[PDB]
Write a protein that binds this ligand. Structure first.
Ligand SMILES: [Zn+2]
Lengths: 94, 71, 125, 116, 61, 121
RNA sequence: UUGACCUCAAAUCAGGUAGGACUACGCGCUGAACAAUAAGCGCAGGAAAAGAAAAUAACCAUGAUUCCCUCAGUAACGGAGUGAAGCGGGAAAAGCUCAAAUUUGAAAUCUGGCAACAUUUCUUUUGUUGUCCGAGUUGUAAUUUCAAGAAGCUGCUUUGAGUGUAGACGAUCGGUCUAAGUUCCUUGGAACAGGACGUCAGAGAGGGUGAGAACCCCGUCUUUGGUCGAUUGGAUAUGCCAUAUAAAGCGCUUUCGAAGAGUCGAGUUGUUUGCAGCUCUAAAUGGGUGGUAUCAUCUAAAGCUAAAUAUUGGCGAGAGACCGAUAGCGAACAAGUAGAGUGAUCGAAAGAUGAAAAGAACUUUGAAAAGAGAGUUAAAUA
RNA sequence: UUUCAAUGGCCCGUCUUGAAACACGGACCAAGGAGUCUAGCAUCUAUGCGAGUGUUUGGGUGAUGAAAACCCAUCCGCGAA
RNA sequence: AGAGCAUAGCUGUUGGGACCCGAAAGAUGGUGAGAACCAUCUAGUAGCUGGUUC
RNA sequence: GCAGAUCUUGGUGGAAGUAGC
RNA sequence: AAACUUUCAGCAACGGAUCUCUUGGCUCUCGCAUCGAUGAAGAACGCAGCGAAAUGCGAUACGUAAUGUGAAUUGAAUCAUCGAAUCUUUGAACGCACUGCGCCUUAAGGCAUGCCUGUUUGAGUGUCAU
């Protein structure tokens, strides 16, 4: 409708088409190689972090989490020492 | 005949006595334009002409205005 | 069903693309099926039509007529075949155009480019 | 002047892709920083515990993390907040220490000149 | 055909139709003059140019 | 017609009168065609016009390449030899001076860079 | 007389930059009628603006900005009406740079010329090294920014603005790779229809083809990927260099700790507490803002800053319970066109033969336009 | 259906005023052409749950169409104590 | 010894151009030469006029 | 969902082959 | 009777409704960031096919080169991609008027204004040293 868009319609020149429209597509992982090898390109980032035994957020989650299956004193805080934590999965062990 | 051909817009709207075009404001540097004249603006805005260079700029953007020759 | 969002199923846009295609796109748009013997010998189902191709008409009033492709009229999506014509009032024979999809190629006009194209589409020469 | 919300589903998807684009850039580390636990500043909400902005310099010092390295391992610093009570100090020092117990910090390469 | 403007394409048709009539008229007028000058030419044209009819061009059986 | 690939394999001053001879040929053929010519006459007009265009392309490309070689590794070169991307792009900060940092920022990133880490679940 | 410095100049000296256009969404200066609106004017970008508290609060306190929800159509103003904000819940999160303290055991700083050496989205782009000149002590670097910090002392932990090579993981651009009836009967000008027998489906989206085609054609699915071109991201690994006599974080103190003025503020006039003009004009535990009606909180008159946010324009893309040629854009075609006006401006009407022009040969009447015999078509009641 | 015979039978719409009348509008035909959308408030009805009730600011999630459907962390609105 | 909350439909009502149409405002910015003319605010209006569809 | 709005757009009548040129 | 008038029907005109169509509009959503003194937007004049009241292009005038595809248009192309060349007179428009009128240097190179950094040549009863 605009005179610029009418101008390029009347022209015999082809349009500068670009094809970048693909939703549902999730960014591929670069950076850590171990994460990339074990990443699942279909699962979401929360599902992948949980499978890899990592934490996607050190804080609370601001909604309901997905449930797929029906599951069945200042002295002793500034001075206590916590001996790390177990590695749940093999990916964390690597 | 109080108007002649304008050196800028080429229309017969160049007042001979005032030496000022009633269409584009020639010889003022800024082209005459008014927001209440929306119809007038679209009659001479970008796109009503060739845009010979602007089309070249749009064509060259995708590859990043690259230069040189292929190997 | 199509799932890519880079392909449009809009009838407005598909008709505009077909009827406003350049000649390079129109070359592939007018493709014809190879005959059974050529299909099993060149390992190719269909090819774009080219001049001097030997074809057989499969559909239409001229069904069964054979002949070479004398000219590929890309501006109208039509094929011109030898001796496949129609008599006019003054006696001059006006050629009749047949769609490329309505003919079958029985002999290819092989050149260097066509042989490379054949092996490009998984085809043994 | 009417503000429509036809792009509400589109903005939901665009923000999800930003989360995935961020996670693609930073592969093994969380997409958010650890926030402290604070108390809202009024008699109506002071019994609730919510998330703060960053950890105070006295909280970081007690937990053993210097303010210059805290940001490098994803621990925000709030120079404005202060610990007026020993409970806020203990609630957020433990939060830092639990964070450091679950943290794998990958080593970095250092330039060691041949001479002295 | 080429013109998708209705007004232009019938302007072009009227122009071509008038041009077709003029050349046909000129050829007919000059043919009449020569055939008047030589009546044998009129005999040849009439004998050779017999109008076609469906009976004459009926398919052979 | 003429082949562009073997046209570049000729000397510069050879291309001069070849353009000259082609120009008189086009002018002479045009004089012939305005007095009556066939449909083939405008066919060789099209070929000789593109041939002149091909000829002038080689001269300008050869001259341009010679100017580029003569001005290689020179601080200031003519504007036609310079880049033409966009007026704003030319005015922008170059990546070298975009990445310039103070010695305060160098020491900060040398001793306290953003670490790579992971959080166990 | 000469020289240094300052000042005024000049030069078609060398090297740069500004203007104009577009402005849907920024931000300003304005400004009517009836709204802090239209219009006018100025200035930008892919976002802009804002922004690391001279901020809230009165609590167990919060903690840059922006945006959304809520607060709330509430308080307040003034009955009507105008109409917020703190808290709370979300999206995104990132912090910093100077001025003010002597490098004084060493202007440690920078532009330019020239000469080499590299480097390139690039013979078009970027630098590096050397030398000379200039800038600069009326102050260029390092150091410091109140969250601190300096100087000493101390024993713990630390360290590259370098340049190659290889492979992997990503992004972009351009090629390349692709399953199955056109079998039989009937109708028809045409089979893409009907009936029979089949086939392929990670492909039964859509379009084309002489009538409703998954299997005739382009495509579609595979493809959230194989395979080649070339460009470049951040990393990893491994060489070669590394000006470390160096530079940092965290301990300690019988030693120090600079903090922005015609500005704050007071009085008086307008616009709308803000802003501005005018007269006057400060302070150092001072000053601002709150709760007290002493306490709390902040640290202004200098500067930068991604993300979440906006987007009727621009470059593309996919859609639709939308309109279907007096509709939908004024414009499905010639459309801001023809045309109208001195000019500012105003501004239409107008889509469909057929599958194929096969667009009616030929004979004949007429000055011609045309007519009549014919002829094409499945149909010229196309 | 056309027409004839017998009987009857005014021109509609608006406005007026007591109904009128009168004055207005109407050459004919086709197409277009007028209580719509939205934000509040109240009523009634239906439906879900019920001292509770309300998923859709947002997050999760959705392999094939992904602007849908599905799930809900912390608040909050109204109601009640 | 609580009866409400949410959604939908209906009806009424109050705002938005607000059933459609019909008088010129006024203002802002321009054109031409006091007056004239043009374009936007602006769907600024008719206590009313006419019309308002099985 | 129309018969009206001195309704909008288009088409076509009687006046009328009249007034007239 | 006839004419005229009227009604009905058939055919022929006139008209362009209805139906069906649709490379158009409208609306929503998504990705992206790219004008100009290295001469833009816009205007004018040419070129060659034409139907221009359209398009493309710029005296290299439907463009040339390069990469292609591979045989048409109706190494081919009224083809695609596109990194190289060319791009008339104008216009912020720039030697002065607005095509003339000019200047300097070697037909060509040039010759606008403001401002910033530097360079060079000068002047000053400026201040000082000899
Ligand atoms: Zn003008």
């Amino acid at each position: 409708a605009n005179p610029r868009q009418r101008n390029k319609q009347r022209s015999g020149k082809p349009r500068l088409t670009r094809r970048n429209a693909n939703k549902k597509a999730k960014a591929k992982i670069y950076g850590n190689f171990v994460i990339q090898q074990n990443w699942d390109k279909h699962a979401t980032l929360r599902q992948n972090y949980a499978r890899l035994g990592l934490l996607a957020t050190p804080n609370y989650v601001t909604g309901g989490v997905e449930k797929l299956y029906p599951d069945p004193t200042l002295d002793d805080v500034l001075d206590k020492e916590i001996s790390i934590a177990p590695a749940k999965t093999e990916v964390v062990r690597q | 005949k109080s108007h002649t051909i304008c050196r800028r817009c080429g229309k017969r709207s160049f007042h001979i006595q005032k030496s000022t075009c009633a269409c584009c404001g020639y010889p003022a540097a800024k082209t005459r334009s008014y927001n209440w004249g929306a119809k007038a603006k679209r009659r001479r805005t970008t796109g009503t002409g060739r845009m010979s260079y602007l089309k070249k700029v749009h064509r060259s953007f995708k590859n990043g205005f690259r230069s040189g020759k292929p190997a | 069903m199509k799932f890519s969002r880079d392909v449009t199923s809009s009838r407005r846009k598909q008709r505009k693309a077909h009827f406003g295609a350049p000649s390079s796109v129109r070359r592939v748009l007018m493709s014809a099926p190879l005959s059974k013997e050529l299909r099993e010998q060149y390992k190719i189902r269909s090819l774009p039509v080219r001049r001097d191709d030997q074809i057989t008409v499969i559909r239409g009033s001229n069904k069964g007529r054979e002949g070479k492709i004398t000219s590929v009229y890309r501006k109208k999506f039509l094929l011109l075949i030898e001796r496949v014509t129609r008599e006019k009032a003054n006696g001059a024979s006006a050629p009749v155009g047949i769609d490329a999809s309505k003919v079958v190629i029985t002999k290819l006009h092989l050149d260097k480019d066509r042989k490379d194209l054949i092996v490009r589409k998984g085809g043994k020469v | 002047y009417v503000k429509t919300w036809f792009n509400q589903p589109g903005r939901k998807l665009r923000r999800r892709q930003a989360r995935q684009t961020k996670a693609a850039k930073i592969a093994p580390r969380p997409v958010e920083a650890i926030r402290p636990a604070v108390k809202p500043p009024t008699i109506r909400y002071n019994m609730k515990v919510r998330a703060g902005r960053g950890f105070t310099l006295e909280e970081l010092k007690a937990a053993g993390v210097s303010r210059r390295v805290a940001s490098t391992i994803g621990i925000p610093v709030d120079h404005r907040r202060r610990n007026r009570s020993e409970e806020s100090l203990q609630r957020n020092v433990e939060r830092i220490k639990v964070y450091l117990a679950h943290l794998i910090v990958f080593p970095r390469k250092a330039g060691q000149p041949k001479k002295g | 055909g080429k013109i998708k403007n209705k007004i232009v394409r019938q302007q072009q048709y009227m122009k071509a139709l008038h041009q077709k009539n003029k050349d046909k008229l000129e050829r007919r007028k000059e043919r009449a003059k020569e055939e008047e000058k030589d009546p044998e030419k009129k005999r040849l044209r009439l004998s050779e140019n017999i109008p076609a009819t469906i009976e004459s061009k009926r398919v052979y059986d | 017609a003429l082949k562009t690939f073997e046209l570049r394999k000729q000397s510069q001053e050879n291309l001069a009168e070849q353009l000259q001879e082609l120009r008189q040929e086009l002018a002479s053929l045009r004089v012939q065609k305005i007095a009556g010519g066939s449909g083939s006459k405008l066919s060789k007009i099209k070929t000789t016009r593109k041939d002149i265009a091909r000829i002038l392309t080689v001269i300008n490309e050869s001259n341009r390449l010679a100017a580029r070689e003569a001005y290689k590794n020179k601080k200031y070169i003519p504007l036609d030899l310079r880049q033409k991307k966009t007026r704003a792009i030319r005015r922008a900060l170059t990546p070298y001076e975009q990445s310039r940092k103070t010695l305060k920022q160098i020491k900060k990133e040398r001793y306290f860079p953003l670490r790579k880490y992971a959080l166990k679940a």
